[PDB]
Amino acid sequence: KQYIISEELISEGKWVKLEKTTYMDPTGKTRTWESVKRTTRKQTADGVAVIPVLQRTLHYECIVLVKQFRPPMGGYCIEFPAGLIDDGETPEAAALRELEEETGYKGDIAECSPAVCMDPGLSNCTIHIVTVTINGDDAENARPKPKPGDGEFVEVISLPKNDLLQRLDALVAEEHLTVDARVYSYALALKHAN
Amino acid sequence: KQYIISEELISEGKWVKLEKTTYMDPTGKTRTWESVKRTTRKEQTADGVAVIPVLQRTLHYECIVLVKQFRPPMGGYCIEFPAGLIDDGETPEAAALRELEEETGYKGDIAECSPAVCMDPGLSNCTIHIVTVTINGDDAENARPKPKPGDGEFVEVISLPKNDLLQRLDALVAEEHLTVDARVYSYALALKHA
Ligand SMILES: CNc1nccc(OC)n1
Ligand SMILES: [Cl-]
Ligand SMILES: [Mg+2]
Ligand SMILES: [Mg+2]
Ligand SMILES: [Mg+2]
Ligand SMILES: [Mg+2]
């Protein structure tokens, strides 16, 4: 019933553009929306976000997260390891690469989502969420060596899966960080299950 | 260590603006970013709310109530938590309960309210509160609920059992052209992983 009629470029940067979208509303009335897109999409999705489940025997399972300064936020954020997918890279491969660059951990693929939207009222940005387990008892994940790219500065924060939400709430109250909504959503469902 | 030095307006619409952000990297070097912001945020502790609406009914499995809408930035239909912007002076809880009623017809009861969490922190400063709400589906107010959607709002309600949410979402993605929201998907994954 609804669909896009046209897209007008308002402004194009190197990484981001703003467009004025005309669409037909379900009454047959024509309407406009201000829409953002990244200029980098080739791919199944713009990017991947990795849910990295650190498994060590006789320890709690942890979810491995990252903390970085995010210029659009004007502050530090706690997020799942994540990045853009390289032209002709698979989402799975992008997931293991990014996880290694940002954390130093080497993991195994458990499952991969379809493309999911980041903020669909604002942008067309999409990611695959890739669940990865990390055998924390293997020698290659003993002393994880992060190989981050140029101009990336990432701190790794591992938190127990079974207390994730309370641990996150504490980091916000204590460190004035912003937790990512996908991370928070995941944490909430862990408590809400059953 | 890191901080914002300046934010230069590139382009401002009615709803969204694009900014050139200058900030200090941790080596002590000046760098830039292209940042998106909404123009609608005033004193609110976030731009908006997303509601996690747990429909509870005697001798029924708990359902998560979701909405399906056309999203101009995406050029297609998306499945999301009920959600909207917080009106000036409105509390996040009030916004959540109001948007839930408007989008779904259901009258909820507040369970919990998250701190402000970031939508896509490498792109925008956009933030939400994630508000968990229970819906007493035995109450007569919630028997035959009707959306009371605003001007240019056109929403379908999809209630899925919490105990099978990921599979039911996957089934929906298999059968039509549409995109699941990344927060919805994250929540569904954790319900499996728990
Ligand atoms: C979405 N904006 C953006 N992405 C990547 C790099 C950058 O500036 C160097 N700006
Ligand atoms: Cl798992
Ligand atoms: Mg990254
Ligand atoms: Mg990277
Ligand atoms: Mg809405
Ligand atoms: Mg609404």
DSSP state of B185: H
Give all strands of the β-sheet with A30-38 in edge-to-edge order.
A3-12, A16-24, A30-38
Q: Per this entry, what is the length of chain B?
A: 194
Task: Give chain B's domain count.
Answer: 1
Asked if A193 has any chain B CB less than 8 Å from its own CB, the reply is yes
CATH of the domain at A67: 3.90.79.10
SS3 A24: strand
Give me the resolution in angstroms, 1 decimal.
1.6
SS3 B19: strand
| Tokens 């979208």, located at residue | A21
Q: How far apart are CA B188 and CA B63, in angstroms?
A: 12
Tokens of B80: 């999301």
Tell how far the Cα of A58 is from the centroid of ligand 5, in angstroms: 45
Q: How far apart are CA A155 and CA A177, in angstroms?
A: 13
Tokens of B101: 């009623």
Find all residues with CB under 8 Å of B20, minimum gap 6, and list them.
Answer: A13, B7, B8, B10, B32, B33, B34, B35
SS3 A189: helix
Contact B74 A117 (CB under 8 A): yes
Find all residues with CB under 8 Å of A105, minimum gap 6, and list them.
Answer: A52, A54, A64, A99, A134, A141, A144
Q: How far apart are CA A151 and CA A146, in angstroms?
A: 14
**Ligand 1 contact, B33 CB (< 6 A):** yes
A39-42, long-range: CB < 8 A, 24+ apart: A39/A12, A39/A13, A39/A14, A39/A15, A40/A15, A40/A84, A42/A85, A42/A87, A42/A88
SS3 A53: strand
Asked if B162 has any chain A CB less than 8 Å from its own CB, the reply is yes
Count Cβ atoms within 10 A of the Cβ of residue B178 and give its class: 0-12 exposed, 13-18 middle, 19 or more buried. Answer: middle
What is the SS3 assignment for B92-145?
HHHHHHHHHHHHHCCCEEEEEECCCEECCCCCECCEEEEEEEEEECCCHHHCCC
Number of Cβ within a 10 Å radius of residue A139: 7
**Residues facing B78 on adjacent strands:** B69, B179
Contact B117 A184 (CB under 8 A): yes
Asked if B91 has any chain A CB less than 8 Å from its own CB, the reply is no
Nearest-CA residue for ligand 1 atom 6 is B33
The approach used to solve this structure was: X-ray
Axis crossing angle, helix B182-193 with helix A181-192, rounded to the nearest 10: 40
Q: How far apart are CA A55 and CA A81, in angstroms?
A: 17
Nearest-CA residue for ligand 1 atom 2 is B34
Domain range for A74 is: 1-194
Ligand-binding site membership of A98 (annotated): yes
